[PDB]
Structures are given as structure tokens and as C-alpha cells.
Amino acid sequence: PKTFTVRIVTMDAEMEFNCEMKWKGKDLFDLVCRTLGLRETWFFGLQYTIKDTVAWLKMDKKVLDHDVSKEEPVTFHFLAKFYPENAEEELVQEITQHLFFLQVKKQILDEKVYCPPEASVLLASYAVQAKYGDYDPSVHKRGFLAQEELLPKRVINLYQMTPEMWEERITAWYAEHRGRARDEAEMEYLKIAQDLEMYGVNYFTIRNKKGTELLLGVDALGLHIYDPENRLTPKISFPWNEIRNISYSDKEFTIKPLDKKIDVFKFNSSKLRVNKLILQLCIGNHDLFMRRRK
């Protein structure tokens, strides 16, 4: 056996490959990207969960050196690791937009990203427009969306309405999207979703030097400090162009601002696996940040 079977899962489908026994992360990754027709690769990674902490396939380490569950077939999930500051300008390819659309929609439906009720209905309408094409009362009669996962449970429970009260609302918006192709409807979804507050934010529980539990936020704009009860609005921000360095040692992070008069910010994070993910996310988001502006 010169190869082992790798199962790749995207938001769209699952597929399989033969991974060479000594292939590194970049080898498998490049193969998955060519197969998809995806040239905008900087956004994506290959993910697997072990002990409930997310890990990303390191490009220059052997796939089999990773501690992924090696129960056949070895499985990874193709997912956006980074988000653009503007989807409509940075996502050139249709495959890229479509994968982003599905990953973000899932986030909003699983309530990992907060969405207000009225925007949730508008979001659903573009999703419906994307899946069914133009509205047609002949084909799409009352009840055609009864089995569809369209709204977050929160919005459904917020104001108790029957599915057919929500269908009317989503259908009413649906009818006004007439003429929009799948790719257009999907980009309109992203344009709304990306202005949501929790969009593109990686959250991590941390503690300041006084022992106060807090949330570190890592996104396309920079590092952020949140209160654990408020994931919508960060109390402190450090934009990528305003950080001189980020230091790490023995579970302690030290953010050093560019402004020499601003005091450093220190925090603790207990897990080594999370600390390297944080550092990774820092390097990546900073790189994409500085490239949009080069």
C-alpha cells in the first residue's frame, strides 16, 4: 500500500483521494484545490476535530504525523479558515463564493453567528432564490418550504409563528428576487451576513492578569477583547496595522501596540493546542490584512 485513503468533506459534498504515505499538508491541500477548480486558496484549510479543539493541517508536516483520528478513512473538512473584509470584491471565483455562502449560512443557522429576526428572513429569501431559481406560484405552492431549514431556532422561537407564517414572510421577499441567478443571490446573502457583528470572528476564552475571564477575538481586522456575556461588541481592539508584536511564553500572551505610549496587554490561555491556533490565526489574518493594502 503506497497510499492511504483520505476523505475530504466540503460544505457541498464529500470526495476521496489516495494520499501518498509521505505526503505533507501542502500536497493533499493542493490536490483538493485543483480538483475543485479553486485558485483562491489562501482563505481555506483542511480541518479535523480532536478532543473538541479544532486543528488545521499544517502545510509542511506529514499528514500522518498529525494526530487526526487514523480510523479509515482519514477525514478532513475543507473549510474557510479566513474571511475577506469584502466578499463582493475578494471572492472572484464562483466556487469560492459558493463555499463561503454555505459555511456562513450554516454558522447563522446553527447560531454560531448572531442574526436579527428581520435580516434572518431576508437572508432566508436569498437562500431560497439560490436553491429554487425564480419564484413560481404554480410550482411553489403554499407549504413548499415546510421541510426547509431556513431560520435560526432563536428567530422562530422569538415571536411564535407557525411555519406557514414564516413561509409567507420568506416567500414575500422571495418574489422580489425574480431575475437573480444562484451566484447573485448567494453574494447578496454574503453582503448582508458579513455586516453581522460576530461574522468572521474567532473566539477564545482567556483571562487577564487580574484573573478576569474574557474572550479573545481574532478576525480580519485585528485582535479584540470581549466580555464573555457580550460577543457582539468588543471593549478593546488592536488593528493589525497597530500591533508591533505578539509574544508568547508559558500560556501567557503579550500584545505590544505600535503606539509606544499604549501599555501592553497580557492574557492567559490554558491550552497549548489553542495557543498555536491563535498564533496561526494571527499570522494569517495579518498577512491578508496587509495585502489588501499593499
Binding site: 493589525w240 500591533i243 505578539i246 509574544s247 511564553s249 495585502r291
Partner: peptide, 15 residues
């Protein structure tokens, strides 16, 4: 548009 990761215990220099 670049970064440099360096041991000492690691320091992430951002430009």
C-alpha cells in the same frame, strides 16, 4: 505585508 516568527518562547514581529 509580511511577518517574522522567532524563538525568544516565541515572538511574532508584525510589520
Amino acid at each position: 505585508e509580511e511577518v517574522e516568527l522567532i524563538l525568544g518562547d516565541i515572538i511574532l514581529s508584525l510589520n
